[PDB]
Amino acid sequence: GNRRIRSVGEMAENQFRVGLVRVERAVKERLSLGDLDTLMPQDMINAKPI
Amino acid sequence: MNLTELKNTPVSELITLGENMGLENLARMRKQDIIFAILKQHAKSGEDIFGDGVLEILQDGFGFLRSADSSYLAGPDDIYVSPSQIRRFNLRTGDTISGKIRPPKEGERYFALLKVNEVNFDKPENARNKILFENLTPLHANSRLRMERGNGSTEDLTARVLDLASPIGRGQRGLIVAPPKAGKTMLLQNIAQSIAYNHPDCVLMVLLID
C-alpha cells in the first residue's frame, strides 16, 4: 500500500517534461530580451533538447 | 553617425578625435580600427549608429554589407545581416540597405542590423512590390546616347569618329575588339569622360579586373 507501479507512460511524461522545461528556459531567456513582430514562433524553440 | 562619413575623413582628424575621446593610442593603429573604437565609444554613450552598403547573401543564409571604396572586399567593418530579416523583407544580393547599426557585443565580430530605413535608395513599401529582372521584356536600343562633346575640343575627334562609326544607345551590348598596345586605355578614358559629360544622369560603373 506504500509502493506504486510506474510504467512507460509516467516514465516518458517525466522525460518529456524535463526536455520541455529545458526548452522553456531558453525560450523565456530569449523573449525577455526579444523584439515584438521581429521573429516567428518557429525560430525561438530549439527542438534539439526534446 | 555614418560609416561613409567616417571613411571619408582623413587619418589625422580621426586620430585627434580618438585622442579627445580618451582611448588607447591611435597613432600606432589602423584607420579601420580607429573608426571601430570611435563607434564603440560613441555607442557606449547611448547614441545611435547608422551604416550602409551593398548586400552579399552568403550560401548559408546570412550576409554582409560590402563597401564600394574597398571594391567589395571582405572587411572587418561589414554589417552582419541576419537571415530572419532577409526572410522578413525578401532581401537579395545587390539590395542597397541603409539602417541603424550597433557595435558587436561580447562574442561577436561584426555590426548587427536593427531597423532598415531605406532600401535601394527608396522606401521599402516600393521595394516590397517589384518585378524581377528576369521577367522584364527586352527591347532594342531606342534612346540615343550621343557621345559627341560639342565644345570643339581636339579630343572630341575620337567621340566624333565613334559616333560616325557606331552610335551607342541605351541597352546596347557591344564589343571593343583590339590587339594589345593599340590605345584601349585612352579610348576607354575618352568614352567615360564623354558619358560623364553628356549624360551625367546615368549610373556609370567601370569594372577593371586583373
mmCIF file of C-alpha atoms in Angstrom:
data_model
loop_
_atom_site.group_PDB
_atom_site.id
_atom_site.type_symbol
_atom_site.label_atom_id
_atom_site.label_comp_id
_atom_site.label_asym_id
_atom_site.label_seq_id
_atom_site.Cartn_x
_atom_site.Cartn_y
_atom_site.Cartn_z
ATOM 1 C CA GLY A 1 0.000 0.000 0.000
ATOM 2 C CA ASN A 2 3.129 2.154 0.147
ATOM 3 C CA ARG A 3 4.664 1.126 -3.202
ATOM 4 C CA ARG A 4 3.490 2.172 -6.661
ATOM 5 C CA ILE A 5 3.899 0.956 -10.234
ATOM 6 C CA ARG A 6 5.464 3.491 -12.618
ATOM 7 C CA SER A 7 5.037 2.149 -16.154
ATOM 8 C CA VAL A 8 6.170 3.525 -19.520
ATOM 9 C CA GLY A 9 3.585 6.330 -19.521
ATOM 10 C CA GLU A 10 4.784 8.257 -16.475
ATOM 11 C CA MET A 11 8.426 7.410 -17.192
ATOM 12 C CA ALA A 12 8.052 9.055 -20.618
ATOM 13 C CA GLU A 13 5.975 12.012 -19.401
ATOM 14 C CA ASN A 14 8.707 12.853 -16.886
ATOM 15 C CA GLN A 15 11.451 12.941 -19.530
ATOM 16 C CA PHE A 16 9.239 14.881 -21.954
ATOM 17 C CA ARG A 17 8.563 17.484 -19.258
ATOM 18 C CA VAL A 18 12.284 17.692 -18.458
ATOM 19 C CA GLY A 19 13.039 18.405 -22.111
ATOM 20 C CA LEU A 20 10.131 20.849 -22.249
ATOM 21 C CA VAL A 21 11.381 22.889 -19.290
ATOM 22 C CA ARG A 22 14.905 22.807 -20.727
ATOM 23 C CA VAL A 23 13.465 24.387 -23.883
ATOM 24 C CA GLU A 24 11.263 26.797 -21.907
ATOM 25 C CA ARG A 25 14.292 28.187 -20.070
ATOM 26 C CA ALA A 26 15.914 29.328 -23.322
ATOM 27 C CA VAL A 27 12.575 30.477 -24.758
ATOM 28 C CA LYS A 28 11.989 32.748 -21.754
ATOM 29 C CA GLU A 29 15.595 33.984 -21.826
ATOM 30 C CA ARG A 30 15.089 34.937 -25.479
ATOM 31 C CA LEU A 31 11.641 36.519 -25.084
ATOM 32 C CA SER A 32 12.810 38.584 -22.097
ATOM 33 C CA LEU A 33 15.216 40.374 -24.469
ATOM 34 C CA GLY A 34 13.213 39.966 -27.694
ATOM 35 C CA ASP A 35 11.600 42.396 -30.192
ATOM 36 C CA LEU A 36 7.829 42.254 -30.985
ATOM 37 C CA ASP A 37 6.955 41.286 -34.622
ATOM 38 C CA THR A 38 10.659 40.537 -35.393
ATOM 39 C CA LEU A 39 10.791 36.720 -35.217
ATOM 40 C CA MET A 40 8.290 33.922 -35.833
ATOM 41 C CA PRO A 41 7.312 31.390 -33.124
ATOM 42 C CA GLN A 42 9.292 28.756 -35.072
ATOM 43 C CA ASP A 43 12.701 30.465 -34.698
ATOM 44 C CA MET A 44 12.630 30.557 -30.879
ATOM 45 C CA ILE A 45 12.102 26.888 -29.931
ATOM 46 C CA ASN A 46 15.113 24.629 -30.452
ATOM 47 C CA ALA A 47 13.796 21.096 -30.996
ATOM 48 C CA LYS A 48 17.172 19.589 -30.046
ATOM 49 C CA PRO A 49 16.544 19.187 -26.263
ATOM 50 C CA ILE A 50 13.235 17.349 -26.769
ATOM 51 C CA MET B 1 26.997 58.921 -37.334
ATOM 52 C CA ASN B 2 27.507 57.374 -40.778
ATOM 53 C CA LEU B 3 30.134 54.843 -41.836
ATOM 54 C CA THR B 4 30.990 56.502 -45.158
ATOM 55 C CA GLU B 5 31.365 59.892 -43.458
ATOM 56 C CA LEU B 6 33.995 58.474 -41.098
ATOM 57 C CA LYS B 7 35.629 56.648 -44.018
ATOM 58 C CA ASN B 8 35.988 59.899 -45.984
ATOM 59 C CA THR B 9 37.596 61.715 -43.046
ATOM 60 C CA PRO B 10 41.417 61.843 -43.037
ATOM 61 C CA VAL B 11 43.630 59.897 -40.660
ATOM 62 C CA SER B 12 44.864 62.910 -38.683
ATOM 63 C CA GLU B 13 41.396 64.171 -37.743
ATOM 64 C CA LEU B 14 40.293 60.663 -36.743
ATOM 65 C CA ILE B 15 43.387 60.252 -34.550
ATOM 66 C CA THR B 16 42.696 63.637 -32.951
ATOM 67 C CA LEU B 17 39.044 62.747 -32.319
ATOM 68 C CA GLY B 18 40.010 59.396 -30.810
ATOM 69 C CA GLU B 19 42.578 61.021 -28.530
ATOM 70 C CA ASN B 20 39.954 63.551 -27.427
ATOM 71 C CA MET B 21 37.507 60.721 -26.685
ATOM 72 C CA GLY B 22 40.079 59.244 -24.297
ATOM 73 C CA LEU B 23 41.003 55.842 -25.735
ATOM 74 C CA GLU B 24 44.173 53.866 -26.404
ATOM 75 C CA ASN B 25 46.925 55.447 -28.506
ATOM 76 C CA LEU B 26 45.586 55.619 -32.064
ATOM 77 C CA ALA B 27 48.826 56.726 -33.749
ATOM 78 C CA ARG B 28 50.007 53.098 -33.950
ATOM 79 C CA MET B 29 46.591 51.871 -35.104
ATOM 80 C CA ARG B 30 44.821 51.223 -38.389
ATOM 81 C CA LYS B 31 42.221 53.696 -39.633
ATOM 82 C CA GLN B 32 39.543 50.990 -39.621
ATOM 83 C CA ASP B 33 40.390 50.098 -36.018
ATOM 84 C CA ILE B 34 40.265 53.803 -35.128
ATOM 85 C CA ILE B 35 36.794 54.106 -36.668
ATOM 86 C CA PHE B 36 35.694 50.934 -34.865
ATOM 87 C CA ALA B 37 36.896 52.243 -31.495
ATOM 88 C CA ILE B 38 35.253 55.627 -32.113
ATOM 89 C CA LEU B 39 31.958 53.912 -32.950
ATOM 90 C CA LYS B 40 32.219 51.772 -29.808
ATOM 91 C CA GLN B 41 32.915 54.801 -27.610
ATOM 92 C CA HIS B 42 30.075 56.769 -29.211
ATOM 93 C CA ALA B 43 27.615 53.891 -28.760
ATOM 94 C CA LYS B 44 28.627 53.485 -25.108
ATOM 95 C CA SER B 45 27.082 56.931 -24.554
ATOM 96 C CA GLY B 46 23.724 55.690 -25.878
ATOM 97 C CA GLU B 47 23.689 57.380 -29.289
ATOM 98 C CA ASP B 48 22.669 55.561 -32.457
ATOM 99 C CA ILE B 49 24.974 54.498 -35.292
ATOM 100 C CA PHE B 50 23.996 54.288 -38.959
ATOM 101 C CA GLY B 51 25.597 52.461 -41.866
ATOM 102 C CA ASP B 52 25.028 51.397 -45.456
ATOM 103 C CA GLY B 53 26.365 49.071 -48.121
ATOM 104 C CA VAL B 54 25.551 46.516 -50.784
ATOM 105 C CA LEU B 55 24.138 43.222 -49.536
ATOM 106 C CA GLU B 56 26.040 39.982 -50.245
ATOM 107 C CA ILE B 57 23.948 36.996 -49.166
ATOM 108 C CA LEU B 58 26.125 34.006 -48.322
ATOM 109 C CA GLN B 59 25.319 30.388 -49.132
ATOM 110 C CA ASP B 60 24.435 29.574 -45.514
ATOM 111 C CA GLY B 61 21.729 32.240 -45.322
ATOM 112 C CA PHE B 62 23.336 35.269 -43.686
ATOM 113 C CA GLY B 63 25.109 38.160 -45.398
ATOM 114 C CA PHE B 64 27.190 41.305 -45.094
ATOM 115 C CA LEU B 65 27.085 44.892 -46.363
ATOM 116 C CA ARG B 66 30.148 45.391 -48.553
ATOM 117 C CA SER B 67 31.630 48.837 -49.175
ATOM 118 C CA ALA B 68 32.313 50.401 -52.563
ATOM 119 C CA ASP B 69 35.590 52.102 -51.601
ATOM 120 C CA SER B 70 37.203 48.686 -50.980
ATOM 121 C CA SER B 71 35.985 47.074 -54.239
ATOM 122 C CA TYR B 72 33.542 44.889 -52.272
ATOM 123 C CA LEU B 73 36.346 43.232 -50.312
ATOM 124 C CA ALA B 74 35.743 41.368 -47.056
ATOM 125 C CA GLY B 75 36.336 43.921 -44.311
ATOM 126 C CA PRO B 76 36.128 43.835 -40.519
ATOM 127 C CA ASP B 77 33.584 46.695 -40.550
ATOM 128 C CA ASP B 78 30.988 44.727 -42.526
ATOM 129 C CA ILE B 79 27.444 44.881 -41.152
ATOM 130 C CA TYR B 80 26.010 41.459 -40.347
ATOM 131 C CA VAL B 81 22.530 40.804 -41.753
ATOM 132 C CA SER B 82 20.572 38.048 -40.033
ATOM 133 C CA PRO B 83 18.637 35.620 -42.268
ATOM 134 C CA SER B 84 15.473 36.423 -40.302
ATOM 135 C CA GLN B 85 15.412 39.984 -41.643
ATOM 136 C CA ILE B 86 16.277 38.663 -45.113
ATOM 137 C CA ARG B 87 13.242 36.312 -44.921
ATOM 138 C CA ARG B 88 11.082 39.178 -43.467
ATOM 139 C CA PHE B 89 11.917 41.756 -46.180
ATOM 140 C CA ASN B 90 12.729 39.375 -49.084
ATOM 141 C CA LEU B 91 16.241 40.758 -49.455
ATOM 142 C CA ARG B 92 18.545 39.546 -52.222
ATOM 143 C CA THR B 93 22.156 40.054 -53.258
ATOM 144 C CA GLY B 94 22.580 43.622 -54.512
ATOM 145 C CA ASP B 95 19.897 45.399 -52.469
ATOM 146 C CA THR B 96 21.259 48.639 -51.022
ATOM 147 C CA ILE B 97 20.392 48.682 -47.308
ATOM 148 C CA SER B 98 20.763 51.716 -45.036
ATOM 149 C CA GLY B 99 19.692 51.454 -41.405
ATOM 150 C CA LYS B 100 20.700 51.704 -37.780
ATOM 151 C CA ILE B 101 23.606 49.502 -36.678
ATOM 152 C CA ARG B 102 25.174 48.568 -33.347
ATOM 153 C CA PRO B 103 28.727 47.571 -32.378
ATOM 154 C CA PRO B 104 29.348 43.859 -31.789
ATOM 155 C CA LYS B 105 28.794 42.625 -28.245
ATOM 156 C CA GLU B 106 30.918 40.076 -26.377
ATOM 157 C CA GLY B 107 31.396 37.107 -28.692
ATOM 158 C CA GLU B 108 30.523 38.960 -31.912
ATOM 159 C CA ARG B 109 32.784 40.299 -34.652
ATOM 160 C CA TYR B 110 30.521 42.399 -36.907
ATOM 161 C CA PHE B 111 27.887 45.107 -36.611
ATOM 162 C CA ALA B 112 24.257 43.998 -36.397
ATOM 163 C CA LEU B 113 21.273 45.499 -38.217
ATOM 164 C CA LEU B 114 18.307 46.531 -36.063
ATOM 165 C CA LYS B 115 15.969 48.524 -38.330
ATOM 166 C CA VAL B 116 16.237 49.143 -42.075
ATOM 167 C CA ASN B 117 15.410 52.718 -43.087
ATOM 168 C CA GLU B 118 15.937 52.840 -46.868
ATOM 169 C CA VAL B 119 16.074 50.067 -49.480
ATOM 170 C CA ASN B 120 17.684 50.704 -52.884
ATOM 171 C CA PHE B 121 17.599 54.461 -52.200
ATOM 172 C CA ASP B 122 13.812 54.235 -51.925
ATOM 173 C CA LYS B 123 11.051 53.381 -49.482
ATOM 174 C CA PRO B 124 10.688 49.695 -48.519
ATOM 175 C CA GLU B 125 6.999 49.896 -49.456
ATOM 176 C CA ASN B 126 8.068 50.460 -53.072
ATOM 177 C CA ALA B 127 10.689 47.681 -52.965
ATOM 178 C CA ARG B 128 8.435 45.002 -51.452
ATOM 179 C CA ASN B 129 6.321 45.098 -54.638
ATOM 180 C CA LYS B 130 8.586 44.894 -57.683
ATOM 181 C CA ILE B 131 9.074 42.918 -60.893
ATOM 182 C CA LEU B 132 12.162 40.726 -61.159
ATOM 183 C CA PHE B 133 14.814 41.455 -63.775
ATOM 184 C CA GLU B 134 14.293 38.039 -65.396
ATOM 185 C CA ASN B 135 10.685 38.981 -66.258
ATOM 186 C CA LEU B 136 11.313 42.357 -67.918
ATOM 187 C CA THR B 137 10.606 42.432 -71.647
ATOM 188 C CA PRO B 138 13.807 43.095 -73.638
ATOM 189 C CA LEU B 139 13.910 45.594 -76.487
ATOM 190 C CA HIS B 140 16.362 47.145 -78.913
ATOM 191 C CA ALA B 141 18.217 50.398 -78.317
ATOM 192 C CA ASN B 142 15.647 53.193 -78.626
ATOM 193 C CA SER B 143 17.109 56.236 -76.854
ATOM 194 C CA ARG B 144 20.180 57.792 -78.461
ATOM 195 C CA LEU B 145 23.224 58.192 -76.194
ATOM 196 C CA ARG B 146 25.213 60.729 -78.188
ATOM 197 C CA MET B 147 28.924 60.735 -77.346
ATOM 198 C CA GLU B 148 29.878 63.989 -79.100
ATOM 199 C CA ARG B 149 31.098 66.682 -76.709
ATOM 200 C CA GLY B 150 30.199 69.703 -78.835
ATOM 201 C CA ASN B 151 32.752 72.020 -77.196
ATOM 202 C CA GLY B 152 35.055 71.923 -80.230
ATOM 203 C CA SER B 153 37.917 70.347 -78.289
ATOM 204 C CA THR B 154 40.723 68.466 -80.015
ATOM 205 C CA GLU B 155 39.883 65.334 -78.007
ATOM 206 C CA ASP B 156 36.323 65.384 -79.392
ATOM 207 C CA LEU B 157 37.640 63.861 -82.640
ATOM 208 C CA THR B 158 37.582 60.398 -81.057
ATOM 209 C CA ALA B 159 33.956 60.817 -79.969
ATOM 210 C CA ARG B 160 33.014 62.134 -83.417
ATOM 211 C CA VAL B 161 34.647 59.150 -85.137
ATOM 212 C CA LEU B 162 32.909 56.804 -82.690
ATOM 213 C CA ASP B 163 29.536 58.402 -83.442
ATOM 214 C CA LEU B 164 30.158 58.189 -87.195
ATOM 215 C CA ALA B 165 31.252 54.547 -86.901
ATOM 216 C CA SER B 166 28.955 53.048 -84.241
ATOM 217 C CA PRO B 167 26.361 55.126 -82.382
ATOM 218 C CA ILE B 168 25.589 53.834 -78.891
ATOM 219 C CA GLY B 169 22.136 53.742 -77.313
ATOM 220 C CA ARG B 170 20.585 52.627 -74.046
ATOM 221 C CA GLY B 171 20.739 48.873 -73.532
ATOM 222 C CA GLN B 172 23.460 48.323 -76.130
ATOM 223 C CA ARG B 173 25.647 45.203 -75.855
ATOM 224 C CA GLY B 174 28.837 45.878 -77.806
ATOM 225 C CA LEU B 175 32.446 44.744 -78.003
ATOM 226 C CA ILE B 176 35.696 46.698 -78.362
ATOM 227 C CA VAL B 177 37.966 44.298 -80.249
ATOM 228 C CA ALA B 178 41.581 45.467 -80.329
ATOM 229 C CA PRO B 179 45.035 43.857 -80.165
ATOM 230 C CA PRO B 180 47.331 44.884 -77.298
ATOM 231 C CA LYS B 181 49.245 48.170 -77.443
ATOM 232 C CA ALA B 182 46.536 49.780 -79.593
ATOM 233 C CA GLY B 183 45.192 52.549 -77.347
ATOM 234 C CA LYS B 184 42.360 50.869 -75.462
ATOM 235 C CA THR B 185 43.142 52.826 -72.288
ATOM 236 C CA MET B 186 42.864 56.285 -73.863
ATOM 237 C CA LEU B 187 39.768 55.225 -75.807
ATOM 238 C CA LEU B 188 38.051 53.962 -72.650
ATOM 239 C CA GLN B 189 39.021 57.146 -70.796
ATOM 240 C CA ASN B 190 37.554 59.281 -73.585
ATOM 241 C CA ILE B 191 34.360 57.200 -73.642
ATOM 242 C CA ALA B 192 33.952 57.506 -69.870
ATOM 243 C CA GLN B 193 34.583 61.261 -69.928
ATOM 244 C CA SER B 194 32.104 61.764 -72.776
ATOM 245 C CA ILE B 195 29.482 59.706 -70.928
ATOM 246 C CA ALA B 196 30.022 61.684 -67.719
ATOM 247 C CA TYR B 197 29.853 64.991 -69.617
ATOM 248 C CA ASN B 198 26.927 64.398 -71.990
ATOM 249 C CA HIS B 199 24.773 62.109 -69.800
ATOM 250 C CA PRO B 200 25.542 62.808 -66.122
ATOM 251 C CA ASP B 201 22.218 61.281 -65.022
ATOM 252 C CA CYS B 202 23.235 57.723 -65.944
ATOM 253 C CA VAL B 203 24.946 55.493 -63.383
ATOM 254 C CA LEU B 204 28.468 54.869 -64.703
ATOM 255 C CA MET B 205 30.356 51.819 -63.409
ATOM 256 C CA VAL B 206 33.859 50.946 -64.633
ATOM 257 C CA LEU B 207 34.981 47.366 -63.965
ATOM 258 C CA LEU B 208 38.718 46.637 -64.251
ATOM 259 C CA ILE B 209 39.589 43.003 -63.480
ATOM 260 C CA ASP B 210 43.197 41.747 -63.431
#
